[PDB]
Structures are given as C-alpha cells and as structure tokens.
C-alpha cells in the first residue's frame, strides 16, 4: 500500500550518499588547510633559527645554512599549495552547501507529497470498508520537478568535480616539481 517511484528513489538515495561522502572530503580538506598552515609557518621559523645558528656558528656554517635555505624555499612553495587547497575546499563547499541543497530542498517537498498521498488513499480504503463506496496532482507535479533538478545537478556535479579534482591534483604535484 505504498507509492514507489523506483528509479527516482534509487537516485535520491544515491544523491544523499554522495552528499554524505562529499561533506566528508570537505571536512578533510579543511583539516588539510589547517595542518598545512601550521607546517608552513614552522618551516619559516625553522628557516630563521637555522639561518641565525648558521652565522653564530662557523664550525657549522655550511650545515645550518644549507637547511635554512631549504626550509625557506619549502615555506614559499607551500604558500602556493595552501592557496590551491583553499580553492578546492571553497569550490566544493558551494556544490554541497548550495547546489546540492537546492535540489534536496525539492526532494523533501516531493517526499512529503508522496507520503501525504499515501495517507490519503489509505484513509479512503478504511472508509470504504464501512457504509460502502467502491466506485495526486501535487505529488505528480513535485515528482517531475525533482526529476529535472536531479538531471541538471548531476551534469553540474561532473563538471565542477572534474575541474576541482584536476587542479587539486596538479597543485599537489607541482608542490614537488618546482620544489625539486
């Protein structure tokens, strides 16, 4: 006695699961941004301590200086990285937080409508099983609305993620190329 739009409901479950996983990648990206920022700074300090020690220690002038230059270079290349990651996080935050929420907002209206329609016919039956009488639009309209949104949403999800994954990957790689 339950209404089921099989294909559509399978897609709604998959979108909820995707948002769940994306929100998770999003949390990791944020942490990534914090830790990267903490690292970057140290390497800067470390770069000074070493450089200082380099001048106040001729016995180890070359050894400290060699490390000071490296910690300094890394710090600089790690600024470009931290930037790229902020862009990754920000971009995906919009997708989940806004684009996906727009659709889900429409998915909730449709489900609410599906359930009230089920309660409606059920009430009709347990009313017929009485003094006899044996002789939907909102649900159907909403059902069509989400079908369209799920389609646009999926198209946009692929473009955004394809670009964000490509660039994030490149940045991560570049933080070794120009660093080598």
């Amino acid at each position: 006695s339950r209404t089921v739009d099989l294909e559509l409901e399978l897609q709604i479950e998959l979108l909820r699961e995707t948002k769940r996983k994306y929100e998770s990648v999003l949390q990791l990206g944020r942490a990534l941004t914090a830790h990267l920022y903490s690292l970057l700074q140290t390497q800067h300090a470390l770069g000074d301590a070493f450089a200082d020690l380099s001048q106040k220690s001729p016995e180890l002038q070359e050894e400290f200086g060699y490390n000071a230059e490296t910690q300094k270079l890394l710090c600089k290349n790690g600024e470009t990285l931290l930037g790229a990651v902020n862009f990754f996080v920000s971009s995906i935050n919009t997708l989940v937080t806004k684009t996906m929420e727009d659709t889900l907002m429409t998915v909730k209206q449709y489900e609410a409508a599906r359930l009230e329609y089920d309660a409606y016919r059920t009430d009709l039956e347990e009313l017929s099983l009485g003094p006899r009488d044996a002789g939907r639009d909102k649900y159907e309209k909403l059902r069509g609305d989400v079908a369209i949104k799920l389609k646009f949403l999926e198209e946009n999800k692929i473009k955004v993620m394809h670009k964000q994954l490509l660039l994030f990957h490149n940045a991560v790689s570049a933080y070794f190329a120009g660093n080598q």
């Binding site: 941004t33 903490s38 700074q41 931290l82 920000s90």
Partner: protein, 177 residues
C-alpha cells in the same frame, strides 16, 4: 555546522593565550605549548551543535606574507589588542582593520580587549605612567569598533577567563546571526 574563526592582532597581545585558555582552560604559561598550532571547540549554542574552528596567527611583520593564506573561507575575525598596550590599540586601525578587509571585505569583525587584568594593577600602572602613557578605556575600543564596523566589542583576560567564554559565544551568533 562548521564555523571558521581567525584571531589576528599585534603580536604580544595574547592571541595564543586567548585560544589555549578558552579551549583547554590553562594559561599558555608553563613552557609555552606547540607553536603555530590551531584550535577547535564543540559548543552548544542554544540547543544547537556547533563545530568551532579557531585559527591562530603571528603578529610580527615577518609573517605578513603567509598570513592571508589562512583568511580564505573565514566566518568571523577577532582583531585583538592589549588594554595595557596603547601602541597596539592604535595598530588596530593602522594595520589589522585594513588587512583583514583587503582580503575579506564582507566578513563580520569583532574587537577584543586582551589583558583586562593588567589595567588595574600596581606596576604596569606606574611603568605605563613612566612612558607617559595610560590604559585603554572602554570608550575608544568601544569607539574603535564603531570607527570600524565591528559587529561587537568585548574585553577579557585569558588569565582570569573573565569575559573569555562570551567572546566566542558572540562570534558564533555574529555568524548564524
């Protein structure tokens, strides 16, 4: 929900002590713990679960180049200054206000008076009078915020905790409004 709060403001003011006191309830004294570290906190703001991310910064010119890197995706800034340090307070408009805006001209800012204790103590009250200076009164700190657009102005001591908890409870409200 995830909110990102970054604490900036002239070095030596007490931004780090402000975050360690608030999150672990202990003065950063006793060794001065893990440098360039960041802090977070889970708080219940009116029957609501909030994940509060706190970003610490460095106040010396030398870190000017890699400071804005922590600014992106921020939800609320905390420009700090010491009520026992007039020189700092001035930099609130001189350096901080312009920078934070140079990057995020649309983010809610809140002014804070770090070190509300060493304002009525016998010593800095004399040496601060030995330099021909004086503490920072409510007005001008209250006016500094207004001279800016700060969504709020508060004062606290990481040593006494007094007014500490309110600082972050406000930052959250300034976010979800």
């Amino acid at each position: 929900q995830a909110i990102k709060c970054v604490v900036v403001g002239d070095g030596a003011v007490g931004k780090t002590c402000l975050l360690i006191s608030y999150t672990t309830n202990a003065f950063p004294g006793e060794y001065i713990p893990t440098v360039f570290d960041n802090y977070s906190a889970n708080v219940m703001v009116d029957g609501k679960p909030v994940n509060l991310g706190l970003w610490d910064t460095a106040g010396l010119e030398d870190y000017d180049r890699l400071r804005p890197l922590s600014y992106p995706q921020t939800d609320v800034f905390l420009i700090c200054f010491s009520l026992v340090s007039p020189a700092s307070f001035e930099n609130v408009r001189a350096k901080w206000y312009p920078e934070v805006r140079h990057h995020c001209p649309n983010t809610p800012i809140i002014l804070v008076g770090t070190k509300l204790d060493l304002r009525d103590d016998k010593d800095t009250i004399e040496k601060l009078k030995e330099k021909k200076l004086t503490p920072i009164t409510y007005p001008q700190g209250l006016a500094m915020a207004k001279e800016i657009g700060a969504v709020k102005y508060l004062e606290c001591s990481a040593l006494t905790q007094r007014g500490l908890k309110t600082v972050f409870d406000e930052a959250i409200r300034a976010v979800l409004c």
